[PDB]
Design a protein around this ligand. Sequence first.
Ligand SMILES: NC(=O)C1=CN([C@@H]2O[C@H](COP(=O)(O)OP(=O)(O)OC[C@H]3O[C@@H](n4cnc5c(N)ncnc54)[C@H](O)[C@@H]3O)[C@@H](O)[C@H]2O)C=CC1
Ligand SMILES: Cc1cc2nc3c(=O)[nH]c(=O)nc-3n(C[C@H](O)[C@H](O)[C@H](O)COP(=O)(O)O)c2cc1C
Ligand code: SF4
Ligand code: SF4
Ligand code: SF4
Ligand code: SF4
Ligand code: FES
Ligand code: FES
Lengths: 127, 178, 61, 196, 437, 238
Amino acid sequence: ASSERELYEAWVELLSWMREYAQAKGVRFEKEADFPDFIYRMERPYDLPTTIMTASLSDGLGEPFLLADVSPRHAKLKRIGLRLPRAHIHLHAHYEPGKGLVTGKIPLTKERFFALADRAREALAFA
Amino acid sequence: FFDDKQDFLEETFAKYPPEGRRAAIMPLLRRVQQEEGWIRPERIEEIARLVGTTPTEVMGVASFYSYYQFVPTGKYHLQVCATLSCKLAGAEELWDYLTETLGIGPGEVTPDGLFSVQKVECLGSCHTAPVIQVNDEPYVECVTRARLEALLAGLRAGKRLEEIELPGKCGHHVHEVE
Amino acid sequence: ACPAYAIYVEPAENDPENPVSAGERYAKVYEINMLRCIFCGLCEEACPTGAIVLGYDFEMA
Amino acid sequence: MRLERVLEEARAKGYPIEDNGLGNLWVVLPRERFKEEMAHYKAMGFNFLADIVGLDYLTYPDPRPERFAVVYELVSLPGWKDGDGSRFFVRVYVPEEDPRLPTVTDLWGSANFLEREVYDLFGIVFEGHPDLRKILTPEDLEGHPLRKDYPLGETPTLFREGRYIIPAEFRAALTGKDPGLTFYKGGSRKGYRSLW
Amino acid sequence: TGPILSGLDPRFERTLYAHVGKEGSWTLDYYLRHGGYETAKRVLKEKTPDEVIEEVKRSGLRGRGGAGFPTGLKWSFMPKDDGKQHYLICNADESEPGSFKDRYILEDVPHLLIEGMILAGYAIRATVGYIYVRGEYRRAADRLEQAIKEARARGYLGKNLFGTDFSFDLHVHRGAGAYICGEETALMNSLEGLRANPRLKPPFPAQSGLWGKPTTINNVETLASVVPIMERGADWFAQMGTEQSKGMKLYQISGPVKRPGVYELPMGTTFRELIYEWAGGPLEPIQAIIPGGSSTPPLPFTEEVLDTPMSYEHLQAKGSMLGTGGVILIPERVSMVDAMWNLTRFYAHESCGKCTPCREGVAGFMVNLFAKIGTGQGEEKDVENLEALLPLIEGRSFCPLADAAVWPVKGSLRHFKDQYLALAREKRPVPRPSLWR
Amino acid sequence: MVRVKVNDRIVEVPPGTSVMDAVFHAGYDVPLFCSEKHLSPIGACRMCLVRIGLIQWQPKLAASCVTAVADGMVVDTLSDVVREAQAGMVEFTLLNHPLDCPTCDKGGACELQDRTVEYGLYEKPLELPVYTRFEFTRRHVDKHHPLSPFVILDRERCIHCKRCVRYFEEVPGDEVLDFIERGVHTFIGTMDFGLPSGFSGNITDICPVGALLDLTARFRARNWEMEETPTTCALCPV
Ligand SMILES: NC(=O)C1=CN([C@@H]2O[C@H](COP(=O)(O)OP(=O)(O)OC[C@H]3O[C@@H](n4cnc5c(N)ncnc54)[C@H](O)[C@@H]3O)[C@@H](O)[C@H]2O)C=CC1
Ligand SMILES: Cc1cc2nc3c(=O)[nH]c(=O)nc-3n(C[C@H](O)[C@H](O)[C@H](O)COP(=O)(O)O)c2cc1C
Ligand code: SF4
Ligand code: SF4
Ligand code: SF4
Ligand code: SF4
Ligand code: FES
Ligand code: FES
């Protein structure tokens, strides 16, 4: 699918929410990974508008409470995932042409995401 | 806690040898789970402290299963069957309706604080597929479009799940197709 | 990879907030000994990111 | 063709015949029987002595009879009148205690410089050579330096801040005797020959 | 039917489910007025331990929760006490989709079980029993505790039960849902309250188990079935089935079929009798049948399949196995792909993570393959891929879960191959029509 | 004592010592990722599969660590069915394991790394190259998380050996590490902060991959480059 473009612009969005939340709540942001296919890129063209494959909001003592990973450029069955550790939550945001970025069928928007984050924060984080 | 509940502890510590202490983790965890509707870290520090092993051990044991919730849950923790038998009778479509009615993802709680949704694998009530179990109180056997919408609309109105009326029957141990 | 031992690389840990290297580890010291150098392309081939790429010069002394 | 009467003979006389399936054949002759054997080769139509390699088996990982073994390559020069192309190696074990060995100066003229070299580089005193003297190495370096207990000798590579690299500890390639960096080698890394 | 022979007996009578469906069935005293604990009263003071082996050893009752070294034999390996109190663990965990037979034994005839465990207990020289009931059955666990309170009060469990020096008790131990606890070695960890993983199989439950001490594990059905055995006889028993597979068995069924449920049938009954005569005939025409458990290869819907006798020694030979007799019938309003898709998405959930072959291989490789095929971003190449993965997994795992997760997908490529090749080669997802009633 | 035969060489080897050792004793060689000296085997990595005849080859391939020797047994390392299976397990282990080698500090001495080049590569002499067959999205979780002033944990790296948890349970007797979720999500984590043991540090060497590394010496010079000087401790009377 042509989903590729549409996912990536959404991925920037997703990050954006995380940065605000980080300064807002008094919890840090931490880049985890960068795309292999950017480091080891070596003459290739480029499409991805950021370089961050995984990133997280941490309690402040280095344990994460919220993980966020996009699928890398090449691989099939692309998705964006979220996960709360220690509480087995594995969320699969897909993109659907004709809706937006959806968790299955429910639209993911900022309010949604922020609420999810605070329920995460409150259970798992000690900060 | 279990500070003022020392008979319950005494009961479960009596069931097992004095060196089989780690056994106590299964019942004790499940007690905390029911009474507050979830287990928060501090609880796990107590369970640990009691049973004579480090927190980290108990964290590992606790996190193994799939009943427990380590985030807040609604009043009616909906544990929807979604394994083969149930799938084949259309558990899929139930799960669409339920989730889109309540409006929440998993790990989220309905704005009321009455409804969490959650998948689970088989419950062993295949004859009466699809089926859901609401907390530790017996299975809402069958779920016809009516029975679902009835269950919800009733539950929002504060009844129990056995006092909300439900069309049809669902068998004792053999059933007949409606 | 080099057969003169001509490349001295002191690595260092990337500051998380101001990068100079895409990954997370970088080159705080990179010195290369030209007098010992033999001219290869084994360097260039080995650096898996294609970072070091032999030039166009000869006018040194 | 010429080769065959050597093979059947070696088998007859109890001289082993080592063989790689690489188009090389070695024939192991002891020291005593060498001279006369080597005489027979010259008669037998092996004109041309190509190589003399001194081999040091000090740290080889499978056992070996004696420490030093030299190996000659004798050839029958094809295109010449009795040219044939019958080319084969001869290996001759030599102890570490006594380094004696028969010269072949009187059976080829190639021998003259080559056998001198092997004296210089490995410690092998060649019996009856018209001349031995050190050649490649100056007379001011003791030992026959191409042996395997002898330091290659290294000198720091030098860089601006006062940083040096000692050559020998960058070197990451590991000898097959060595244990390797992890607990043990196995598999491919004790040798791998890609299937044909 | 005829002497020491399979097929529906014309003289049959229900035994185990002689009250089930009716109520007053968990009054101790109701049970008592139907010969409750009679069979125990006789046996403990009269018969020797050896006989309670031998009797069952002749009855020939092989395993009960899906295969098993003959009930009779599994019991011979005990040491018969060298300072170690034995433990009898009833595996009343009943995951395995489509299985739900044991459920009703606890809910409706608990006191049957309790007696069986008193019998069994005495045979293997035990003095403590754990019943590990599934983590999703509350009703069953209440109803079981209730029976144990009754029985414990009046001295049908307790000290000095009928003049012997056995004193044997049971405890309920509520699980918490995790299929892997179903395997007998995982279970020992579960009770001991350590994370569910298996353990090494060169020892067997018999020589070490729960806190080191010799355990014997049996499936609930088997344990209940010890009571008729000791009452009526191996001679009464023997009339049914082929030789060494005997007793009746609670075949159960689910999925589309006009009667779903439990049919207490004599052994050796065919699919035909079960599916038509008993289960009222089909709904939609059946595409394939998953014969017992869910850890079995599917068998196509065919006459030669339908007429196959259901037994552990004819279905052995028909290239599948037989789990708990819990058939699932698969209709043609879904494709086989969606059936195995859903099944192996179950196993990926119930992978435990310890084994490499099943961590990365099934729950990491396989799920994603199915998903790719069955969304139709497919390639022909994938069916070559998927097929070729299978022999690396089958052989080698540290626990028999994996081999149960490959076999259905193994089987579906031996017989039904075409359907997979169809959806891939034309690149189209599954057709999912309505199925919600 | 007992006659064990590995391939083409026969060995004596005292009875009660598992197959694995008899293999290595014979000079033939097989992988390993879950066992280690002084720890305890519990076959788990499922690497060390050989084939066994006692003679009559079995339809089941024993994991060398968890099966004892038996007299007159033949054990085969180099056999076509074996080699195939080894290729397999290597391939599975690498399936999820973040591509990060050059920047990993486990360098030229990453036990996974060394096994791969020894045994690896899946079926096909080649005329067209074969590399990976995964093409879905990898596992992604947390990495480079300090657990303590002396141990950094890059969780995602792990291959789920049991060596460290196993070590902790047996050896210092303090329990401070164990796996968390189940199925594929599994990851080692702690609920004690500072990692409190007087023997925390051993996990750095023991962990086969590069999951548990010694923070005090992270990023200072690549693994191979260091000059390795054997000597003796002098800070305490042992
Ligand atoms: N009904 C169900 O819920 C399920 C059915 N299954 C069936 O279960 C089987 C796997 O169960 P397992 O217990 O691993 O089978 P198994 O081969 O170990 O035999 C079953 C029972 O026999 C015992 N046993 C076997 N050999 C013994 C020996 N030498 N000494 C003492 N006891 C011995 C085992 O401990 C176990 O209790 C599968 O092959 C399948 O047929 C598979 C998965 C689930
Ligand atoms: C992964 C796995 C899961 C199992 N789950 C169950 C189960 O849920 N119920 C069951 O009765 N047997 C189950 N079994 C079969 C066990 O062998 C069974 O619990 C035990 O053998 C019962 O004793 P029996 O074999 O004497 O009947 C399972 C086996 C495996 C390998
Ligand atoms: S070209 Fe590079 S690799 Fe080669 S000697 Fe020079 S510095 Fe070394
Ligand atoms: S086969 Fe799977 S569920 Fe079974 S022990 Fe192994 S990883 Fe766990
Ligand atoms: S972090 Fe290391 S030692 Fe621990 S399980 Fe992982 S690979 Fe093993
Ligand atoms: S632990 Fe090993 S395989 Fe993983 S990134 Fe490091 S060097 Fe690589
Ligand atoms: S598959 Fe749903 S109750 Fe069994
Ligand atoms: S070393 Fe044998 S299974 Fe791991």
